[PDB]
Amino acid sequence: MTEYKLVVVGAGGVGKSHVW
Numbered sequence: 001m002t003e004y005k006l007v008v009v010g011a012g013g014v015g016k017s018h019v020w
Contacts, residue, residue: 004016004017005017
């Protein structure tokens with residue numbers, strides 16, 4: 001929950017943050 005983890009991981013974990 002610092003930038004995208006609040007949306008991608010904040011929802012359940014789509015697997016986008018894995019790229020960054």
